[PDB]
Symmetry: D2
Subunit: 249 residues, 4 copies
């Protein structure tokens, strides 16, 4: 199976969790993969892990400030200049929130809006600049089940993830004439560092609320990134695919 054969791919937040599982699955399927991480330390750790798994595969790693379009452009530009093209952009880096409304500070709301929305806008804009003249490409934006069904706390999380769905819808409709597809992915509860850090009572809570009686594995989200990036999904754009196993927050 080589669903993304010879596709030049960038995965933001590709150092751990869903993004890292996607790096592996995309390399397994013939893609040329580059990853972004928050810090250079996280990037070095992930590149060393990928070097053990794939000793003959070259994987580029960068740590741009996702809130700065110039910093994202510098990193995206290096990938496009090394391979002469950019086929796939996955705006997967993201954070969550669970604070009760009264305890949501200005700083916390600004930060989740910055990373989850401005980070996605910057990545999609920089990918588009490298894809527009080639008149081909795929931009994948990671939303959440909370972007559709809301949440009971951490208002910045459904607000930012609903914005990602809205950005995906509008951008997809706008740039389809340049043969560039824009698709969203809205996961439910996934077994990563984002969810495994919670207290045991919250973990117990999730596991009883999940209709599948298990969290999804990062591979189950990464397999959807894989299909959506492949030419099999040539009819899918300006929409968000729910991958939540019927979980409802």
């Amino acid at each position: 199976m080589n669903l993304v054969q010879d596709k030049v791919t960038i995965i933001t937040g590709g150092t751990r969790g869903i993004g890292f599982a996607a790096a592996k699955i995309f390399i397994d399927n013939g893609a040329k993969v580059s990853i972004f991480g928050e810090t250079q330390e996280e990037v070095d750790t992930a590149l060393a892990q990928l070097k053990e798994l794939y000793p003959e595969e070259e994987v580029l790693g960068f740590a741009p400030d996702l809130t700065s379009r110039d910093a994202v452009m510098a990193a995206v530009g290096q990938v496009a200049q090394k391979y002469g093209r950019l086929d796939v952009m996955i705006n997967n880096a993201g954070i969550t929130s669970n604070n009760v409304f009264s305890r949501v500070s200005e700083e916390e709301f600004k930060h989740i809006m910055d990373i989850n929305v401005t980070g996605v806008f910057n990545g999609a804009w920089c990918a588009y600049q490298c894809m527009k003249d080639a008149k081909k490409g795929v931009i994948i934006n990671t939303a959440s089940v909370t972007g559709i069904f809301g949440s009971l706390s951490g208002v910045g999380y459904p607000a930012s993830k609903a914005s990602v769905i809205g950005l995906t819808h509008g951008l997809g409709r706008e740039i389809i004439r340049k043969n560039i597809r824009v698709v969203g992915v809205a996961p439910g509860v996934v077994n990563t560092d984002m969810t495994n850090g919670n207290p045991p009572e919250i973990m117990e809570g999730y596991l009883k609320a999940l209709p599948m009686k298990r969290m999804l594995e990062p591979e189950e989200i990464a397999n959807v990134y894989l299909f959506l990036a492949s030419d099999l999904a040539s009819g899918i754009t300006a929409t968000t695919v729910s991958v939540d196993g019927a979980y409802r927050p």
Copy 2:
């Protein structure tokens, strides 16, 4: 090369032409054991002969049950389950459209589109569930439409029936996920099949140019989404409908 549905016993309703027939081919290519349903025995015979030319060593069963009769659907689903010992995938793809102005929509026309597009999907999903529930495994795929989400400017029975399919998929998916059976919808935009061809090229030239992709989707582009959704790659996808419309808005 690919074998995304290897050894999966699959039934495709409306598998004699358009999207369903393209799915029959793509599913056989990917290792599935395929059975098709068609509206008439003549359509079934034609499709089986076409598939026999393409795949001379492949056995494909064909049936023409009245989709509005659950006993007729159960008899056909039962024969497939009896022959292979299980049922892994059910695709409720058979459907029809409408474009009549509201004043000209007869009682008979509204009843018929509601019967085929909704009762036909309910009957197929119910009969599949009965053959899947003890195995605690399976995938049910229901074909909706872009009109089920964005409405239409005419033929009210078409968005009404296709929105019902999305609602059925959502509710059924939430209900039977505890039996490890996934229920997923597919909402196509405008697809190049017998459903959409008939108009002269002069009329169609301006229509195609106004489409966001400047072309209709091909039946293979919908069938490839059936393939992914039926595969173990979509293990996290249930109680939802995937839009495959190339940004087309009715």
Copy 3:
């Protein structure tokens, strides 16, 4: 307050629950009200109740088979003939389902599809025929929260109520050029004969788990019918308004 002053109104399922609460609120706001019921007995009971409340008000009552468009046309036609016009049509009559999928018979699925969807189509079609030449009117269709968020059982209920939302969207887009508005109302859990079952010991736990800690009252749905039928809602069409107090099935 006379939000529907002199508006000739038909309310299907106006003999009890939401429909009956709407009959009272519409009479209070100056409308000329006619009600439909399943049986002649229900119609006689409701008309007598409205005579004790409003002795000087004339209310017409009919019991047409909602699955027969000719029977609905005969009743709608009599109202339009008596007042010379039809201003408001409320397709409020409906039923629910809670049977587990295996136990949903052909007959049960056919019946809920017939009453909840064909009944709404027939009422909307007959209203349209009496409104189209006047180039004014409002058609209100009662959906449900299950039409948007699904359900855990009784598949015919989300299937039929999602169809009502789809019919409302398509019909609204089609006939807005004739200055006829088509709007949906999606209630959550309302205190009527439809939810009047279980003893209080069992109910106490259920009510406590509801986001508002109570069901909605039929007046709370009828007040939304009132606004939507008024000229205040002149910009609202081809959409469904959620009146569920944040309840999620």
Copy 4:
């Protein structure tokens, strides 16, 4: 008609357009109105216009930086101090975008996200702090049709307005236990300074694409704010009402 009798109301962006039409309709319906505007000059102009219409009515006016929660709290706090309570908060201030994706600068995307989302979050948070102990109140957030159906350009506009819908959904579900309702309003194309200044070619396109063959008037949106703020809408929360006359971008 006095749908919002004795209700202490704050309207952000109440100096012109929809917000100003709402100021008038809310005063007509018995509310105690306070307005916010971008500049002190706009506030002075609107207060003078309202003094000519209502010479005996006192209307407070403020121009806080909506991106600063402390500046919004200072203004909201003064209203709550003067009347001892806050009954209604309308987060109506907003801006639009129509730039092609390549021409959307970092600055433009940041600004629309700041005003349309952080401005709504700040207003809703400050209102909640003044409403939570009273265990009653209504927060109205202005989204847009583009938040549901996307757009063909100005990606910041559907992204920010979809975020407003997501914020409304999540916040509504979270604070309904404090008897505070959170509702959204999604207008189509409204005849205000936001749209009326466009070149004839763009105007022609709008008028052709509008199924009603006219734009909605600001009163048609303000009448929906009125109903949603009234006790008639007691069952409506954690949802967005479309007021678009079947217009689709």
